[PDB]
Every structure is written in structure tokens, then in C-alpha cells.
Amino acid sequence: NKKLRGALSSAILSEKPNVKWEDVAGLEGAKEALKEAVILPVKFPHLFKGNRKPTSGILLYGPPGTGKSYLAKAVATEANSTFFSVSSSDLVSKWMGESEKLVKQLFAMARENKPSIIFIDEVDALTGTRGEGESEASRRIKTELLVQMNGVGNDSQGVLVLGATNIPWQLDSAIRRRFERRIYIPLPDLAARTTMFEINVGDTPCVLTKEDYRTLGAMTEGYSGSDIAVVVKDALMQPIRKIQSATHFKDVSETRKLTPCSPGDDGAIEMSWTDIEADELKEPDLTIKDFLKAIKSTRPTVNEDDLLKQEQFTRDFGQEGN
Amino acid sequence: RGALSSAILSEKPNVKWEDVAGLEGAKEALKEAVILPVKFPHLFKGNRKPTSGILLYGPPGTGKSYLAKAVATEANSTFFSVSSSDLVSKWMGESEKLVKQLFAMARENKPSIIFIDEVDALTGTRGEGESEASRRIKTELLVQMNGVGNDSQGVLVLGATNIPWQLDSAIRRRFERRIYIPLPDLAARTTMFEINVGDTPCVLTKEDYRTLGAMTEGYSGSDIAVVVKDALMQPIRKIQSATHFKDVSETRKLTPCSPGDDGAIEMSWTDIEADELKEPDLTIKDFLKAIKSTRPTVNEDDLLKQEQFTRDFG
Amino acid sequence: NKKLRGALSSAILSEKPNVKWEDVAGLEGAKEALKEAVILPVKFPHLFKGNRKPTSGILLYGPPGTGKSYLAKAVATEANSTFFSVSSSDLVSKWMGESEKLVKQLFAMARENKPSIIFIDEVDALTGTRGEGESEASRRIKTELLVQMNGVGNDSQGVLVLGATNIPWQLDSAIRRRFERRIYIPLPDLAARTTMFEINVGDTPCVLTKEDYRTLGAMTEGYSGSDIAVVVKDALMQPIRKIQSATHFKDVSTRKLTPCSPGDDGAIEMSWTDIEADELKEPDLTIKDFLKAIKSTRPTVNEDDLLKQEQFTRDFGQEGN
Amino acid sequence: NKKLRGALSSAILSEKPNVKWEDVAGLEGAKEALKEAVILPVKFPHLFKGNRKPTSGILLYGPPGTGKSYLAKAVATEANSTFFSVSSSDLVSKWMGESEKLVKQLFAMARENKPSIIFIDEVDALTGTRGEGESEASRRIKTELLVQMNGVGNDSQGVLVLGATNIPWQLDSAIRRRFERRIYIPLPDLAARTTMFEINVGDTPCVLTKEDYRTLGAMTEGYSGSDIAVVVKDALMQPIRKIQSATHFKDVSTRKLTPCSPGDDGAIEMSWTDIEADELKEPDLTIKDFLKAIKSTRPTVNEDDLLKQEQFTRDFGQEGN
Amino acid sequence: EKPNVKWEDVAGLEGAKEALKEAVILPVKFPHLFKGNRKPTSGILLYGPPGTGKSYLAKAVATEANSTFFSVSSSDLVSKWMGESEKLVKQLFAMARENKPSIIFIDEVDALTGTRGEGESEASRRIKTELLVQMNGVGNDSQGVLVLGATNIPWQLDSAIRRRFERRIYIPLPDLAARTTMFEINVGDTPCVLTKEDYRTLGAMTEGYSGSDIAVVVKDALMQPIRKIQSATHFKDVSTRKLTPCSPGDDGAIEMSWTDIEADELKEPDLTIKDFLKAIKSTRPTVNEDDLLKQEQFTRDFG
Amino acid sequence: AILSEKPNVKWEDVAGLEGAKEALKEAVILPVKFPHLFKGNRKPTSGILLYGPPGTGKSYLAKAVATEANSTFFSVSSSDLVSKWMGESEKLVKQLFAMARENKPSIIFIDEVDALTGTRGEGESEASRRIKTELLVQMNGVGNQGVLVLGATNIPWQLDSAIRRRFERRIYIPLPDLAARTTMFEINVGDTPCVLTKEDYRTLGAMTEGYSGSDIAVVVKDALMQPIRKIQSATHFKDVSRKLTPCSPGDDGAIEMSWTDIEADELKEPDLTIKDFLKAIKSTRPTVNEDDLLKQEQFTRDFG
Ligand SMILES: Nc1ncnc2c1ncn2[C@@H]1O[C@H](COP(=O)(O)OP(=O)(O)O)[C@@H](O)[C@H]1O
Ligand SMILES: Nc1ncnc2c1ncn2[C@@H]1O[C@H](COP(=O)(O)OP(=O)(O)O)[C@@H](O)[C@H]1O
Ligand SMILES: Nc1ncnc2c1ncn2[C@@H]1O[C@H](COP(=O)(O)OP(=O)(O)O)[C@@H](O)[C@H]1O
Ligand SMILES: Nc1ncnc2c1ncn2[C@@H]1O[C@H](COP(=O)(O)OP(=O)(O)O)[C@@H](O)[C@H]1O
């Protein structure tokens, strides 16, 4: 009975990934819903008294790579509560009955450590609409999930069941009834893309301006957040390729701060960068040409049919996440 | 053994018969089946036998577990709210011993009532499933549901199921009373809004509740509850939109108003202490915004499958 | 935990197949990307700090038999890291809920032995777009890979997930999102074919020149690397066939026997069975044996699979030279 | 561990069926290729040192009943090495993730006994081009085969994957790349037909000569080796039919009795049940029984699958002749 | 598993009878013959229209050979699990070679596979190829084990399976003497007044039927007297109370039921020609006409 | 899983079905009554299929045959065999035939032969081939006297043709008639206190054309609870004979309040009426579709 809690104690993370609300570019409706879900019942407990109850479940859905796990990291950072990060490897067991006793002990620990947050990434693996799947695991896990979510003699009060999935239409109808907040996280718009570029570039010394970031956001038409992250990564790795595949360096302005340039200048010394020791390194600064080359190299991942499926799911049972 | 100390609840959740909006036939059937053998014990003897099996079904989120909570509140009897988690073990034979001792304790604690939520977790139709944990448990439940001569006085089995066509036909025939819980009508919608608002101050009238129930076309009970929750949370969002606060009348009860007024004290909202914030009142516009936000959680395929099931086994 | 680690301890290869970067011909973009993402964070760790992070996953796709596993062998040789080479037999198990703990313990061992490189050959078998596959094991192993790659409470820093598949359009969209660099490995051009011929012939005694290698590389149009390897193997096997059909031997220059035309100076007419070892002299390689091997062995890949690979490249990939 | 080896120990054959290389008619190129690839690394291992490596997989395709399994029996006879005869029932299992472990254990058992031969009969039943078949079985078994043949951390040196199929155009492109030599086994010609007649007549008493066998081989054009074997068996059973369907008998010259016409020298009428042992003499063979068997049994090969086999040969095939 | 049907109980099918007789009797009775190149037949396909005594002839060979028999069917070698419908065939051939010499009877070989055209490709290919490897293979050495296959549709088989089956014997429609002999063995030991000319006219009338059709019309003509005993009134005491049914109203037509009739005294009426005429006028032929053309074509290119 | 009993159901205990009983009785009872009639190649029926819409008590009729043949009744449900028992089912079908052999004269009753035999083209291996392959072998057990198999089906159209063919004799069990429905009402109320006359019973009979015994049973169970129903829930009440029974507004001595207001055991439950059942008839529709008379009669025409 204690080995179950010892196995489930590895699902409570204590690393606290530093993702703040200013790190998330856009998604103001989802951020406001998560704020009124977690920040308010701990900061202002004198408002949720009587017939006013907080939210008891939020389903984040959308295209792959839009920021659902990033909002989960931001909630785990700024929640100041117990965060349960479970998956299909922490609930399914080899024996018989342990696959439901683990879920019962997980919800018992979540109710014992209230206020607590249960984050189940990829809820479509556990809830497979119980029509054709494996009888034992599917039926028992889904029914125990329903009973531990509301049930009769459980009274789940103060816990939050976060869920992030890419396939929202393959959920069970009872699970979709349990998740009382269907929040659609879409692909980012122009202002969100420009703020995401401003966040991902950071304190790197570059000649880019706000008009340059605006033209970059206008260029990335249909990109996702991971695609913006990898074109920022490619544009940041571009000065390393510039300092690798070039010769005829030149000391600019400091203990020989030498920089690659055109062959033939005021001191175009023909040597290699491997002989250059550290801290006499003046790499070329970022321009718009490196980000244009990163845009030309890296291609968008999300197609234009899954967007139609997510749009049909929003018009069927979904809200908007701005 | 002693592991069944969590199947019975001692909380008694305060859900009375007036809280259950609508469902008059199911309410009166559960009422007679839980009251009349305790009210008039001479009425049930021999031929005129009471109901020993009650099954509830319909769309998901219509009031099955709510009716079970109402029975557990206004029954005055031992409630056995147990599911498939406390019936299956790692060993062999203990999965039958659990059901045997469960029915033994339920017969020893007469008058009792056993409520099995999601009974399809025990009825996998034994196609190619787990033998020792499916078929033997199903036959044990079939021979322990043979209390038409054994448990004439005492226990009563219940059932709540969202998907009732995937159910074993033997236990379906053993459940003699199968009541279909439908989507609520307009009067049930209006009294459900009246119950869910409750003692919260508002300006909503009976005509406002009637047009709210007319706007909710095809909504369910949980959808009505989360619409009421969103309408309750909307004045907190209006306070969070803090601009040009204004004091009303005791001991500095502030209230935000339109930008540009008489006495528009432009300040924040977190600088003020508690118990002096006169919150705005519930209009109909926040309710209409919650209606436009919240979507119905049920589809048309489940409704036609429920219609097929009730026309096949009404 | 310890049983799964004892089962997964036979996945770290300690063989180190000696394939260097000069052995691979062509594929300059794939070479440069693998070179930075393998060599640079373990050689110069002071550069990758702050906003600069290395590549966390590289996918190699193309027609069958182009050099994806050869590039993986070169990475495993020149990586100086704990090279994890898994497939669909080390992860899938018989019991219930034991295939996910295998992947979790694999990624835990990769994080415990960082810097590490995970090479999953034929990723198309594990990931099948989770549309109509076998529900429990398929969807759970896909969601377990998706959680263990980046996830929330994992923070995979230092590991690398290499992929090598022949059919990349059957990959899941989230898995294609995880593989942040799709590198297309195409059919080789004339300089790469000439370099592969010079590498595969190598130190063999032959009279072949640069013009002969250029004509061979111009002749093998549409061929692949395995086809070049087997025509070099057939051209090397042909002197043993000439030794088999070697009537009228001729000892030219400790009695090194050499076949010739029937009837010559010193035409000792015998067979090669009675001739003992450590004195044989094989005939030299000419361009005629290689032309015979080219006329004997056909190419493997056709011209519609290349169209599908180019379609996937222009839709969701980059050109890897 | 013990279960997989106990299940795969039955795949090794030790009976050694005696079929020599002279028992196969024709197929000179296939005979030469199989002869070198099974004999030369076993007999003379000093010829393949470094740059020259033997063949690592041979596909024997063609029409059904052409001598593919007979050629595999000849290789298993004069191989002098370990022979693995696997099929679909020995690799495919009922449990989840058990067939891939069986293929891995099969190749690991074959690598411990180098040199070894793995004769996967009917590779078309285990390779279905990964297009539309069963997801788990198809993708996982084909992926385990593609990884286990060469792979990265395998180093398959000293093995040979012999494959015999009838529909080679329904194979995967990666599997066709894996099989190096795709040798065509075409229909036999006149010389192979006469050689099959000369080896199928055996040592039975007959009056047939070389020109008789040449005329028979000219008459059986459009047939195959199984058809030649069944007309030889039918012509061998025709004198037993003449024994059984006869009433008038005759003792010629310890009672070497033979049937006769009704009315002869000593036309004794009795039965073969009354005929005891060591006294029965069969009638002699002639061209009439062979012509009757040829006119009695019809061929089995059609004329469009031969065109498809010729198309696959012209696309990606060698010549066995 | 041993039936009790000898050679004489099968009517007609002379070529199939002599072929099976030599192929399963010649090695087991004369071991001094099959030496050297003389090998027995290792496969026989018995096709044709259904109901024409194929399993009856298989039981005749199972009786008269005095050897071990295996009488599995198509549904026995088809499972729902993945890769379990081939280990059954492997264990079948293993237990056949364990008790050599043996006879293997496989029914509905057209329904065992699906000629890998449109059905389940994985299961079809694995079943077919495992059947072929268990038939000849490489290290399977099937000597003395006879594969006796029977089917109703031969043209939906595979080229490799029809190559593995050596002698493709056709079971045709029965003839006049076969129909009369089938009537004579189907009527049994019941008290009858039927003659050989009556059997000849019956067999001339039932041209185009099958053996199962002849069996069920003999069963109908045998059940019709005990049907007319029960479904009749106004019985007649002929000649210690021998009662016989007649028309209502006769020379002493006693109207009663069969409940008050004493045991071992009720006169059962003998069956006549009109019962068989009613049976043949009631029963219709079952076979089609294009299947005979398909059998003609199959014999025409695989005679 | 296998029931066994020496039942005591006479022909007269089975309402109606006189036409079906006479043919079935002559087929089975005549053989048993006068066995000397069946020497040689004349052999009694040993398979009989009973088919017709549900709610006709095909089971009850089957027990009557057993009672009248003076045989042990052995019985099994095919639905249970196929689902509940699952694998042990082969063993069960065996043991069943084995018991019956050991206990001649005896009768095997297989109920819902349609829930077992399903044409074997798409069924699962163990239940399909094993369950449907063992029954057939056993019904060939006539050849290896003394036992009879009676199959029961509601949906004969859905009955495996192979199984179908083992049931030489087929007998249609039709829906009930006026006299029988009248008897069913009487039996179903039996001793219960009520004021129904002989004529009321006939009325109830006449008013339930197309109902089955089952239907009538459900309707009667409903009606008998009406006086309890009235006593439990009444707006106003009234003293009689002190016992307060429910009465309409402003009845003689009509005091309105609620059942809750009234003392326990002094509450008067309403008396039983013929009219009240009429209520119950309206709220229970018949079970059996009207196309059944033809579908069953098609079978009587074809295999009767
Ligand atoms: N909306 C966003 N705002 C900020 N960063 C983002 C956003 N979307 C993606 N990213 C960046 O790209 C990564 C991919 O997003 P992630 O949280 O992994 O999405 P997912 O839930 O699909 O797994 C993030 O970790 C972050 O670095
Ligand atoms: N008849 C009803 N009266 C009041 N609220 C109801 C009713 N039916 C549904 N609801 C609302 O919807 C919820 C659904 O009922 P609940 O017992 O939680 O689950 P379920 O109906 O799925 O068993 C209730 O908790 C309540 O908030
Ligand atoms: N690009 C290449 N550069 C050098 N050698 C190559 C190349 N492509 C193929 N080869 C040669 O052909 C063989 C086939 O490549 P391999 O790694 O097996 O490819 P795959 O990934 O398809 O399994 C290599 O082992 C090598 O000998
Ligand atoms: N060239 C040949 N020499 C000798 N026998 C042959 C030859 N070709 C075919 N046969 C005979 O034909 C039969 C078919 O052999 P096999 O290779 O098993 O055909 P397949 O593999 O196509 O089914 C063998 O029994 C063999 O004796």
C-alpha cells in the first residue's frame, strides 16, 4: 500500500522550469482562463464561497507544436501548488487491479495535497472512446478516471485536471463532458509571431529593429512556435558557420578581437579559427539576412487539413483561445 | 474483509428531492422503491413484490449520479457506492470473495442499497476478454442478483450507464426496471437555472429565466451548471477590469463604473482590503455571453443510439 | 527497474565500426549538420550558452540504399559518446504496460550517460500517424515517445534522436514536429559516384586511372551506393572466375602463376586445383571487368518513389545535397 | 532466452538430404553463383581478405516448380555448413512483440555458428512492400528483417540469406536492395529436359536411347521440372497398371512370370494376389508409355505470368540460364 | 477415428476407386515393388459437384488401408490469433510423420485459402505458404504420408497448390447403375416390395440428382408410411386386432386414434412406388448449370 | 449451467397451443407409448425445433412434453453457453448429452438455438467452431434410442442452416387466444384480493389481442400494485369501515392532506378493480411484431 505512493512520488516534479507569463507570446484568453483557474483560488479565497466554485478541468487542444506544454510549464512555474505530471507509463501496471489502484492513489494524493494540479499530457492515449479498444485496460481505466473525476463519493474540490492533446475528436464523450473548458490553442498571428521572435532572440547583440521583427513576422506566414524557435536557433548558429567557413580575419578595435571579413583588407591575416584561443572572439552580429536564410531553409510542419479538423472541433464543442 | 471500509460513504451529500430538476417518473419510481417498503411494509408480500432492480441510462451528464446522490441523501439507509476498483484483486478467488463478502455485508446491514456506477466496466460481453476477472465475476453477480426469493427484504441494486447497448444481456434481463433519463425540457431548464443561481442576488425575472431556457436548446445539466459558473465568474472579471472605481453608500463599498462619471476615483483593485468591494449585479448579458461561449457537449449520434436502445428495450 | 536495465544493457554498441567522414561521398549538408550537432557541443561547450542551443533531433530520409545507416555509422565512430542503437524489438514487450517503461528507462539511461546519441533505425514502424493502428500498444508507445522527447518534466538536454526511414510520409505529424531538421538523402551525383568508386576499389592493385573512374561514374546513371558496392564486389570477384577458367597457365617472373591465352611461352597446361596457396598472382583490374559488372547488375530504385521523396522534401523538408 | 532457443532449435536440419549438383539440370549461372558463394569462403578463406567480400544474400525467383527448393536442397547437401530452414510458422508468434525477438534470436544463433545459411522460403509471404497490409505484423517483421540483415550494430559476416519466391514484383524496394543477386530461374530448354529425363529414368530397365530422350525432350516443350517428374512417375506406374489390369499370364524361361495377350504359349489365367513374391517380372519400358503420360498430364504454367517474370528480369534481374 | 465403410459401399466412380486403391494399397501390401525410383503418389485432389461421395470415398480409403487417419476440415485450420493457424498445420504434419504411414484428409481446400487476391493477404499468404512448405519443403521429408484433398470448387485454387496435388481426379455426376445401386444401399433392410425394374425406372426418373438427394428421398419414402400411420383416421380391422388405416367409410371403418391401439399388433403398411413418385415430384434438383461447364473446363485443361 | 428436472406440467397446464401440442405429442408421445411400432428402419423423431415469437412459454410446453413422455427434462440456454460459460462450453454440451444418455427416457432442451448457431463464416474460433461443431456431433448421437432434442428459437430465420437441418420436425408456437389470455389473467392474479367477475376476466382477455403470456404477466404485475400506489400517494383521503383511503376532491368525509399526514397501518390501500387493469393494458404495449404470424406461418408452410 506504501509502494504505490513510493512509485507515484516520482510524478511530482520539483525542478520548476522557469517559464513565466511574459515568456508565452499570445494566447491571452487561455492565459486568462488559467489565471482565473489557479491564481485566484489561492490569492483571493474570499470570493469562491457559497454557490461559486472554481474550474475543475481544462482541455487544451490544437495543432502539434502550438504551446500547450509551454502553458503547462508556465502553470507549473507560477502556480505555487503541487503539480502532478503523469502519463500512460505511470498508470498502467503489469498486474491486475494495480492499474486502477494507481489512479485511485494518485487522486487520493491529489486530494490530500490540495490545492494540487494534475496534468495529463496526451489524454487521447488513455481515453479511446471505449468502443473497440482493449477491454480490461480501456474500460477499467476510463471508468476509474470518470469516478475519480466526479463520481459520487469522492468530492473532487480544489484539484485541477489539465489535459493537452493533439487529437480532441478521439476523446470519449464522458471525458469531454468532464472537461468543462475546451480551449483551442491556434497557430500564432502576426503580433504573436513578432513577440515570439523578440523573446527567442533575447539579449544577443544584433542590428535588428522592430520593423525588422515586423517584416520577419510578416514573412513567417503559417509557421508554428517550434518552427519560430528552430529558425531562431538556425539564425543564431549562422555566425558559427560564418566563423567556420571563412578565412582572412581582421582585428577590429582589446587583446586581438579578430573578425572574419572579405579576403583582402587592412590586416587580412590568413589563418584558421581553430588556432584562435578563446576570449579573443568577435563573432559577426545577426542581421536580417541570416533570419531570411533560416526562413528559406526551414519549412512549416503543420498541414492545412488538421487545421480543418480543429476548426470543425471548435465549431462543434470548442471555445476560442485568441 | 476489512478492505471494504471505503465502499460505504458516511458523508451524506445534501442533495434533496427538490434539487433534482425534472425527471418526475424516475424520481417517483426511486421514491416508491426506496420509501414504500420502509413506509408500509405490509403492502409488499407475496405477489405484489417490490422492485429489486433499477437501471438508469441516457446521454452522459443528465442526472444519474445526481439521482443516486439524492437517494443516498433522502433514503435513510446504508449506501454501498462501490465500483470495479474494489472488486478485482491481484490474486485468484479473491475477486469472487470480494463480491461474496460485499453481498454478505449488504444482507447483514439490511435495509441497504447497492449503487454500481458504470456497470459496463463489469460487463465486457465476454467476447475474448479476461476469463477469471470477467466471466466468473459476471456469473457471481448473476447468482447474487438472484435475490428475488432470497433478498425480498433488504438490498436493492442500482445502475448508471452512459452507453447501455454495450451491456450483457443476462444482467440487462435481470435489471427489471430500466428508466431512460432524457435531456431536460423547458420547465426543468428554468428550475435548474433557479436552483443553480440560488441565493445569489440578481435582477433576472421569470421571463428572463424562460428566455434563458428557450436559448438553451439542447443543453444538458452540466452545461447549465458551467454556464451558471461562467455567469458567476463574470463580475470578478469586471472587477479585474479595474478602471474608475466609485464608492456606493456602508464603510466605503466601492464599485467600478463607466470611464467618466461623478466621483470616478481612478485607482487599482488590489490595493483595497477585503469585505468592502460592492460587486456588480448579474444582468442577462453575461448569461448570454456564457451561452455564446459554452457549447453543448452532446452530439446527434448518441441521441439516435439512445432512441434505438429505448425503442429496442423500452 | 533493474530487469529493464538488464534487458536494455545489450543496446549500447561497444564495437565502434571504423567508418570515417571521408568514407562517405557527397551529402555535404547532412555532413555539416551532423558535424555541428555531434562534434560542437562536446568539443566547444562554451559557445552553446544562453540563447544558443544544439539540435535535439535529426531525421534522415530518402530512397532505400543511399547512406543513412552509413552516416549513422560515421556518427557512431566519430561521436565519442554512448551511442544508443535501438529498434522495434528492444522497446516492444509482451506484458501489459511494460513497453512504455522500457522507453522511459532507455531515455533515463541516455540522460544518465549524457552526452549520448539515440539512433532509432526505421522510425516508420513505431509511429504510424495513430489513425487506425492497434490501439493500446501503438498509441501508448507513440505518446510515450512524444512525452520522452521534449515533454514537460523531462528536459532532454544533451541527447540526440537520429532517425532513418525510407517512407517518411507515414510519420506522425507530432513526431515530424519533434524531428526539427528533415534532411533528404538523395541519389548521388557524378563526383560522389567517382569518390565511391575510388573508396570501394581503394588499395587494390589495378591499372584504373582518373579518366576510367570518370567514365565509370558517368556510366552508372541512376545507380545507388549499394549498387556501386555490389558492382565493385563483382569486379573484384571476376579475377577469381578467371583463375577458375585458367587453362594454359604461364609462370611470369618464386613461381607466381598467371593465366593467358591457350598456347603461349611457357604454357603449362594444368588446372588451379593442384596449385597450392601463397604463390598465386591474380590478374589486374581493367575497365572491361567493371563494364561487365555494370552490364550485369541493374539499379534498384525506380522513378516514382523518387517523385514521392521529392514531394515530401518540397512539402516539409530541406535538401541535404 | 531458453524458450526462444528451444523453439528455434527445430529449424536447424541435420538429416542432410542427398541431392548433388549433378541432380539439377541447366541453370549454369545460378549454379556458378551459388557454388562460389557457398564453397569458396568455406574452402579458400584467404582469397577474400579485406577489399573483397563474398555475397551476402541471393534471391532465386521464377515460375513455380522450376527447381528453386531443389537448388536449395543441393546447397544444403554440399554446403558443409549450418543450414537454417525457416518459414512463416516458426517466426510469427501470437504474443505482442514476439516475432521480432524470434528473428533476432534466429540471426544471433546463425552468427554464433559461422558460416551459416538461412533459407527463408517464400519471402513474399513475409514481405508485402509496407503499403496496405497488417500494421503490426507487416511493419514490425519487415523492420526487424531490414535492421537484422545489415543494420548498424550487427556486422553480419559469414551468413547468407537464401530466398525463393514466385511473385518477386510484390516485394519491398528495401528488401530487393537487401538481396544482392536476383537470379532468374527460367523454364528449361531442350538440353535440360533431356538431362532431367536421363536423371529421372534412374537405373530401371528400359530400351530408350539418346535419340529417344532427345525426341522426348523435343515433345515436352512448354513444360517444367515437376511436369517431367510426374510424367516419369506416370510412365513408371504404367507397367504396374499393365500388371494389375491383366488376366492372362505367362511364365517365361525360378518362375519369372509376366503378363501376355489372351492366347499365347502357356496362357495361364490367374491373379497377382495369387502371384507370390520374388517371382513377378514387370513389362519393359518403351516410348509409348512416356508418350501416353505426356498426353495424359497437362502443363500448369500459364503465359502471362511468364511475361511478368520477364519484365521483372529485364528491370532488376540477372540471368541463370 | 475409424469408420466402417468398405470398397463395395460406394456406387460408381471406377477411375477414382482404382486410383485410390492402387495408390494406398500397392505400397502397404507389396513392399517389394516400390524400390529405387518407384515412389507412391503423394497427393490426390478429389473435386467436382458437392455431395457426390467424396468424404464417403475418403472414409472407404480410411477403412481399407489399415493405417492412421486424420480427417480435419477447413474450419479446424482457421484461427483468429495472429500466426496460430499455421502451427496447427505444422503439428498436424508432425503427428502425421510420427505415425507413418498416414493419410491426411483436408476438406474444402478452396475455403482454407482465399487465393491471396482480395481477402486477408497476411493470413492467406501465411496459410498457403505454410501448407506448401509442409507439403514438400526442404527438411520435411514427407515419405509415406499421403495428402488426400477434397473440394467442391477447384477453379478457385492456387497454381502452386494444384502443382502440389499430383492426381487431380474428377468426381462426375452419377450414372444409371450408380443411381440404382445407391437406391439399393439406401433402402436398407426395411420390409419392401420393390423390384429391380422398379429401381431401374426410379433411377431413370431421378437423372440429374445427387447422392445426398437420393439419401433424403429414401429417408422421405421411409418416413412416409409412419407419417401416414399417424396422420390418418377411420382405421380398419383386417383379418387379433390387426388395424390398418383406410378411407373414411369402408367395410368396418373403426374411427379411433393410435393411442388405444395395442403394441405389436398395428399393421404397418408396406412402402410402394407412389411414395417414391411423391418424393421425386416434391424434391427438386439443387445444382446449377454453369458449374458443370466450369467442371468441363477444369477437366479440359487439367485432365 | 445445466438444469435437470422431472417436471410436473400436464398438457392442460399449458394455455392453448392445442394444434402444436397434438402434432408434437403424436411425434414424441406415440413413440414412447407404443415403442414396438418402431422396430427396424422406422425410427422416432429425435430433433424438434419449436419456433415462434417470444413470450409463448416454449419452455413450459417443452416441460409438458417431458411430463407426458415421463422423461427427465435437461435444459440449457445457448445465450449463456455463448457468453457466460465461454470456453467450458464444449465440455458443457458434452456433459449435457452425456447426462441425457445416462437418464433415458429423457429430453434435452436448448433455448435460443439462434444465439448459438450463426452460419460460421465470420464467428470467432472457440465459441463459433467449438460450440456449433460439438452440438452437431452430438445430434449425430441418435445413431451411436432414448433421447430427444427440442430446440427453441424466436428468430428461426437467424438459425444456422446446419443446425436447422438437424431438427427434422419443426413446430410453430403461435401467439395466445381469448380463452388462454383469460386463463392467464386469472392465474397471474391468483389469490390476490380483487373484485373482478368472470365477465371482467373475459373482458381483459378480449382486450389484449396480440399480447403474450409474458406481456400479460407484466400487465398484471403492474395492475396489482395500483391500490398500494393509491394509498402511498393521495392529495385528499377519507375514513371508511379508522382507515383513510384516497378519494377525489370533496368526497363524503373527504379530508385532504397527504399520505405523510396519516398514521401507519390506518392507511387504506385501494381495492382491486377490473377497470384498473385496463389502465395497465394501455401502459404495456405487446412485445411481438405482427409480421410474426406470417414469418412463423411461412415456416409452418415450409418445414411444418
Ligand atoms: N506560444 C508559444 N510561446 C512561446 N514559446 C513557444 C510557443 N509555442 C512554442 N514555443 C516554443 O517552442 C517549443 C514547443 O512548444 P511546446 O510547449 O513543446 O508545445 P507542445 O505542447 O506541442 O509539446 C516550446 O517549448 C517553446 O520553446
Ligand atoms: N436534474 C438535475 N438537477 C440539478 N442539476 C443537475 C441535474 N442533472 C444534471 N445536473 C447538473 O449536471 C451535473 C451532472 O450530474 P452528476 O451527478 O455530476 O453526473 P452524472 O449525471 O453524469 O451522473 C450535476 O452535478 C449538476 O451540476
Ligand atoms: N553516400 C555513401 N557514401 C559512401 N559509401 C556509401 C554511400 N551510400 C552507400 N555506400 C556504401 O554502400 C553501403 C550501403 O549503405 P548503407 O549504410 O547500408 O545504407 P542504408 O542506410 O540503406 O542501410 C554502405 O555500407 C557503403 O559501403
Ligand atoms: N532442374 C531440375 N532438376 C531436377 N529436378 C527438378 C528441376 N526442376 C524441378 N525439379 C523437380 O520439380 C520439383 C519442384 O521443386 P521446387 O523447387 O520445390 O519447386 P518450387 O520451389 O517452385 O515449388 C522438385 O521436386 C524437383 O525434383
Ligand SMILES: Nc1ncnc2c1ncn2[C@@H]1O[C@H](COP(=O)(O)OP(=O)(O)O)[C@@H](O)[C@H]1O
Ligand atoms: N457415390 C456415392 N456412393 C455411395 N454413397 C454416396 C455417394 N454419393 C453420396 N453418397 C452418400 O451421401 C451422403 C452425403 O455425402 P457427402 O459425404 O456429404 O458428400 P461430400 O463428400 O461431397 O461432402 C453420404 O453419407 C454418402 O453415404
Ligand code: BEF
Ligand atoms: F506537439 Be504539441 F503537444 F501540440
Ligand code: BEF
Ligand atoms: F452521465 Be454521467 F457522466 F454519469
Ligand code: BEF
Ligand atoms: F536506405 Be537504407 F536501405 F536504410
Ligand SMILES: [Mg+2]
Ligand atoms: Mg505538448
Ligand SMILES: [Mg+2]
Ligand atoms: Mg454519473
Ligand SMILES: [Mg+2]
Ligand atoms: Mg539504413
Ligand SMILES: [Mg+2]
Ligand atoms: Mg519452393
